[PDB]
Curated annotation (Swiss-Prot), chain A:
Function: ICAM proteins are ligands for the leukocyte adhesion protein LFA-1 (integrin alpha-L/beta-2). During leukocyte trans-endothelial migration, ICAM1 engagement promotes the assembly of endothelial apical cups through ARHGEF26/SGEF and RHOG activation.
Family from the record: Belongs to the immunoglobulin superfamily. ICAM family.
Subunit structure: Homodimer. Interacts with MUC1 and promotes cell aggregation in epithelial cells. Interacts with ARHGEF26/SGEF. Interacts (on T cell side) with CD81, CD247 and CD9 at immunological synapses between antigen-presenting cells and T cells.
The protein's name in its UniProt record: Intercellular adhesion molecule 1
Modifications made to the protein after synthesis: Monoubiquitinated, which is promoted by MARCH9 and leads to endocytosis.
Residue ranges occupied by any Ig-like C2-type domain in the UniProt entry: 14-76
Recorded superkingdom: Eukaryota
Part of the whole protein covered: 28 to 111 of 532
Source lineage: Eukaryota, Metazoa, Chordata, Craniata, Vertebrata
Protein source organism: Homo sapiens (Human)
Cell compartments where the protein resides: Membrane
Designated gene of the protein: ICAM1
Induction remark: Up-regulated by coagulation factor Xa (F10) in atrial tissues. Up-regulated in atrial tissues by rapid pacing resembling atrial fibrillation.
Disulfide bonds: C21-C65, C25-C69
From Swiss-Prot, chains B, F:
Function: Forms an icosahedral capsid of pseudo T=3 symmetry with capsid proteins VP2 and VP3. The capsid is 300 Angstroms in diameter, composed of 60 copies of each capsid protein and enclosing the viral positive strand RNA genome. Capsid protein VP1 mainly forms the vertices of the capsid. Capsid protein VP1 interacts with host ICAM1 to provide virion attachment to target host cells. This attachment induces virion internalization. Tyrosine kinases are probably involved in the entry process. After binding to its receptor, the capsid undergoes conformational changes.
Domain of life: Viruses
Subcellular location, record wording: Virion; Host cytoplasm
Complete-protein stretch covered: 583 to 856 of 2179
Assembly: Interacts with capsid protein VP0, and capsid protein VP3 to form heterotrimeric protomers. Five protomers subsequently associate to form pentamers which serve as building blocks for the capsid. Interacts with capsid protein VP2, capsid protein VP3 and capsid protein VP4 following cleavage of capsid protein VP0. Interacts with host ICAM1.
Record protein name field: Capsid protein VP1
Species in which this protein is naturally found: Human rhinovirus 14
Swiss-Prot record, chains C, H, I, J:
Residues represented out of the complete protein: 26 to 66 of 2179
Superkingdom of origin: Viruses
Official protein name in the record: Capsid protein VP4
Complexes and interactors: Interacts with capsid protein VP1 and capsid protein VP3.
UniProt subcellular location: Virion
PTM description: Myristoylation is required during RNA encapsidation and formation of the mature virus particle.
Described function: Lies on the inner surface of the capsid shell. After binding to the host receptor, the capsid undergoes conformational changes. Capsid protein VP4 is released, Capsid protein VP1 N-terminus is externalized, and together, they shape a pore in the host membrane through which the viral genome is translocated into the host cell cytoplasm.
Protein's organism: Human rhinovirus 14 (HRV-14)
């Protein structure tokens, strides 16, 4: 099943956070994170895990990791909160 | 156009094609049209990529060795110094290719070899040398060179190819087995003896390749990595076999390591889970 | 649609042969024969 | 000299090009070809042979028992087994079909699923083997299962049922690796009536499940198999 | 310019490629070919000529005696000689057949073995020349020897026996270098009756053994010969 | 299909083919079918690799010399300085090839030459020079160059090939012997004289090759090794000969060294040992 | 070896050369082609479809109103709209014709200009749509406009007028980008009589203007379009 | 005026196909049909 | 199955000739003739 | 004596065209016509 780390994070307004998407499938075809934030895929080897630096978080957002893996839930949402 | 499925309506058949006896060891060709009402579809497919010529038929790296070009003055073991290197040709050292070939008992093919030489100069060097590699195919059982500038390299009979480092060589070798096909599996011995080796046989000797850098030494050391790529062509295969499930441990043997991990995945749930 | 000239004298030098047309799995899937019709030589 | 213009890609080594090349052993005459039985022309020939499915893959180690689907007497409207139909994964990964399938990326066509009953001759059972095409969940009760493709199997002198899983898809090819879009559906088996054992017999009887390909099977795009791996070159 | 794509191996020097090449002496007219006897087209033509075997290679130096197989009078049920049949080794290494054979890796076909008696005309002897096909040891007594291929040779006006060693193998080709799997068997000679010398004559009489190839002989894979070596270039 | 063996059953022959007389000097073609009951087999074999064209017909290194590219100012003997080197062409200097050729008395062939030049810079060098080699075929008896930049190199008649170091040249030379074939053995003299040389003759003059590096000098010294490969083609051979058993000592002579080791292997055991 | 001479440009990568190249997936069989409606062979097929012109591009933002040409009641000898005919610019830049046109450098042929009246059925109006060929200014009064190509349009049951802008040029091709020499002229619309609205109706009624290409249209020299830009590569 | 030999066995290896002769925009420009002449199947 | 064009004017430039078909060892193996049938010229 | 194969689909890719056979300078050297023979259209 698709997984996101962290499950939840509280971060300062405008800061960056690293969100990890992972699958149980070893070889997923689609794996990413859906978010309106500016993001940067960290150079990381492998197919079933990705890390994104979601930059300049301004509001409460719910970035969703997605995949095409058919085991379990193919999507996982994380909850970003801003404090200011 | 080859028909994949024929139109078939309700059937009150007394010649039940879906009840059989697998005790007989035959896979009766029961089609979708036998158990469900079907429409007529066409194949649009020849199966060109499942032909053994294609399935076992692209170039794969089957050996990699590093040799050096350096001052050879005052060295006893040139082989240890990596001035040259030889390798008994075999397609068993890479597991992907080995498993594919081991899907069959007997295999006959001609060999197309591609040798890629790439140079590196890790230590301080003022320039990159224009080195030439000699790849010498030695026939089965022929003497391999013993030193970097041995007279074996000047063999009037051994096929040799000279090419620049950074470039490739390509040459085909015909099927060179003694028997009508290579024995990818051999359940026997070379002779009736109590202690003799099992399985590994001289029937599957494909030759050997020796490599050296022809150039004399420069002021610096150049490390040359030689990658041998084998492509089987004109492939004939007999007697399909159970695919390899466990890791390999040696060339020419079916041995697998002790304490290996289970092959069959365990179910996340009981037998009823989807 | 396609052309090949043989540039070398050896059969081992030719490119791959292509597809074996006459493919039939009954060798492996239907190897059962009644031995009471005397098929044996 | 014939004026020529070398194109891009000149001097490249493409591992799939398949051109003519000079022979290192000119005039060599290879051993003549003798008749050897069991010549394989195409891999689509051998995937059509039934091999056992380790359907009961609930054990910590690999055992013969992994191939035995347990049947219990006096079970009513109950499920025998259920599996998804990712043929290059799960219970199918190790079968001959799955092994040959993992060497390719795309697959199309129908599958031949077989069950062999191994219980005593004096037993009786009616089973319903259901194929649930994609789009619906794996059936959780027999009623749900029997709305799709199914076969009611009466175990008797013919101990083997052969149900075809018809190619049931919009897209013409499915991925051999598990994918939501190219999901192939579900396979389940249920007790139609029940299993009845004769007196003086007790315990579990077993089914053997076999998988194979129908002659309309297709495999397209070659890839490496993830079944075997190596980190070091092997020697003699 | 005709668009071309240079392939891998471009610019390589393969020592066996055999292509056309420009002439350095254009328009040169070589001396006409005159008839010279003894033209050799194929090496399979010359290996069919018998040459002597140094069967008696028990001497410290190379002598004419190495070619003389001693025969002793009044020996009964005894062995004359025995050798293995690695034609590219042992007693055969220096013969014409062995020399031409060492230039190739594989060999198949039958061998022609001959014996010439050189004793006095008034002597008599019956010998049995036995070929033991591979799989069995070298025969240690005449009884064992005569169970295989053998010829009982009565020495008289015809002083020469020619026994063929029939190609007796499962695998179609044998290695010219000694190998257990591709072993060719054994050759032995035994006294059938005995050697009887006339009065006024004493000592050893001798046999000459010859080897040659039958017209069905084959040699496949060229290799260097290990008979001659050099460590330094020669000059005039 | 050519028959190797014919089916042959029991034989009560009075025309005994297995009793002969080697005193006559003929190898009567006695077949397996003459002494044993045989089955019918086929050859499946043409003998393409035993034809003299193939047996004597792959490229072999027949000369190797090192020449240098260096500042030539203030040198009297350029040949000694290895600025250039010449070599009377001969296929006798490599023993493998010599023995193969000496299996015949007369040999006629055209020559295909491949010259491989490889550069080395043992001393300190800032880069690898882009050197050009001139390989000049000089006809038999023609003057060889005497200095590195002699006018002999600019000969309007001598065939010359210019190629980069690290690459190869290839050119064929027709059969250039005066007589209808080369005399690989000559039992005579150039004329009836008491003191004249024996064996070595001008009949077998194949020419000569001169080599220099055309480039002027750089700041560093470059060592170039030139390997000449000869391939005989359109080969005709006459009068088979006894193979060479003993080492060679000189070109054009059949001499062997004193105190040579025995050729015939000694038997580990008596004449009866297997 | 066939003697060849490599020409200049050997080894160059020209992005428009279109030669044969080796396949990385030999023997791959692509999915068969099924019938899909609306196949496009040539872009000259689709430019012939009318799309709306944002003729009223007088707004700060992009609105539906940009496509509505206002018509006012009780206007006499007055202008409705006027535009230059640089089809790859101005009001045309965003239309389908303009978009496809910006991918090419040269254009020739006639344009199809349409107007659709959207006012109430009980209204009436006669308009004159004038094409002023190049060389003269944009007409500033109806008299000037009606000396060139024009159509007097009576709005009634047929709510749509289709005026062709005939190819009117000396040079055979015009630049798609605005240029003085290759100017295409002007397009204006004027009230012929007036707009009369029925009682109980007031305000502005609107015209919709459409542009398309006649079947004699030509587009020659491919270029990049300046409609869309990027400074950074996109990701998923 | 022009020549092409196919050097590779695959259709994907051939150069571009050229121009689709039979180009007709009525698919897009004139898709109107009267539904009272029963053109529907 | 095989093709060769001669690119050079000289016979010495052609590739190797191939196999001498008519191979017969009796020259060397059976050089014996009866001299009483007057075979000598 | 000479051979050309077109390797490219475009006319602009072909080598130079060669010589214009029908060369006649009277266009420039003899452009005079009597206008009383009504040569004008």
């Amino acid at each position: 099943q698709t997984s996101v780390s962290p499950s939840k994070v509280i971060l300062p307004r405008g800061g960056s956070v690293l969100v990890t998407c992972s699958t149980s499938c070893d070889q997923p075809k689609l794996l990413g994170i859906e978010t309106p934030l500016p993001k940067k895929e960290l150079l990381l080897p492998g197919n079933n895990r990705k890390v994104y630096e979601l930059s300049n978080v301004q509001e409460d957002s719910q970035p969703m990791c997605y995949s095409n893996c058919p085991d379990g839930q193919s999507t996982a949402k994380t909850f970003l909160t801003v404090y200011w | 156009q080859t028909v994949a499925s024929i139109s078939s309506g309700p059937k009150h058949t007394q010649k039940v094609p879906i009840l059989t006896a697998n005790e007989t060891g035959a896979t009766m060709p029961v089609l979708p049209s036998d158990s469900i009402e079907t429409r007529t579809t066409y194949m649009h497919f020849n199966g060109s990529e499942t032909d053994v010529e294609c399935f076992l038929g692209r170039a794969a790296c089957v050996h990699v060795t590093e040799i050096q070009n350096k001052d050879a003055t005052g060295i006893d073991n040139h082989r240890e110094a990596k001035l040259f290197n030889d390798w008994k040709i075999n397609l068993s050292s890479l597991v992907q290719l080995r498993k594919k070939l081991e899907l069959f008992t007997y295999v006959r093919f001609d060999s197309e070899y591609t040798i890629l030489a790439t140079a590196s100069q890790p230590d301080s060097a003022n320039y990159s040398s224009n080195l030439v590699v000699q790849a010498m195919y030695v026939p089965p059982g022929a003497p391999n060179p013993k030193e970097w500038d041995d007279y074996t390299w000047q063999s009037a009979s051994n096929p040799s190819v000279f090419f620049k480092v950074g470039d490739t060589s390509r040459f085909s070798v015909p099927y060179v087995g003694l028997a009508s096909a290579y024995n990818c599996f051999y359940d026997g011995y070379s002779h009736d003896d109590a202690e003799t080796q099992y399985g590994i046989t001289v029937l599957n000797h494909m030759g050997s390749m020796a490599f050296r850098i022809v150039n004399e030494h420069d002021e610096h050391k150049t490390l040359v990595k030689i990658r041998v790529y084998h492509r089987a062509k004109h492939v004939e295969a007999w007697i399909p076999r159970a695919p390899r499930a466990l890791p390999y441990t040696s060339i020419g043997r079916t041995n697998y390591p002790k304490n290996t991990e289970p092959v069959i995945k365990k179910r996340k749930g009981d037998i009823k889970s989807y | 649609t396609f052309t090949v000239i043989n540039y070398y004298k050896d059969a081992a030098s030719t490119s791959s042969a292509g597809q074996s047309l006459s493919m039939d799995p009954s060798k492996f899937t239907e190897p059962v024969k009644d031995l009471m019709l005397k098929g044996a030589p | 000299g014939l004026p020529t213009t070398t194109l891009p890609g000149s001097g490249q080594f493409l591992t799939t090009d398949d051109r003519q090349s000079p022979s290192a052993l000119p005039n060599y005459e290879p051993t003549p070809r003798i008749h050897i039985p069991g010549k394989v022309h195409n891999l689509l020939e051998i995937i059509q042979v039934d091999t056992l499915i380790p359907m009961n893959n609930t054990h910590t180690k690999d055992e013969v028992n992994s191939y035995l689907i347990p049947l219990n007497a006096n079970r009513q409207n109950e499920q025998v087994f259920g599996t998804n139909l990712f043929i290059g994964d799960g219970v199918f990964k190790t079968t001959l079909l799955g092994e040959i399938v993992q060497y390719y990326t795309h697959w199309s066509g129908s599958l031949r699923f077989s069950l062999m009953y191994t219980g005593p001759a004096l037993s009786s059972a009616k089973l319903i083997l259901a194929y649930t095409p994609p789009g619906a969940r794996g059936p959780q009760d027999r009623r749900e299962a029997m709305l799709g493709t199914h076969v009611v199997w009466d175990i008797g002198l013919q101990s083997t049922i052969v149900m075809t899983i018809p190619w049931t898809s919009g897209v013409q090819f499915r991925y051999t690796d598990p994918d939501t879009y190219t999901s192939a559906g579900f396979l389940s088996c249920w007790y139609q009536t029940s299993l009845i054992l004769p007196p003086e017999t007790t315990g579990q009887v077993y089914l053997l499940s076999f998988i194979s390909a129908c002659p309309d099977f297709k495999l397209r795009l070659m890839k490496d198999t993830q079944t075997i791996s190596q980190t070091v070159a092997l020697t003699e």
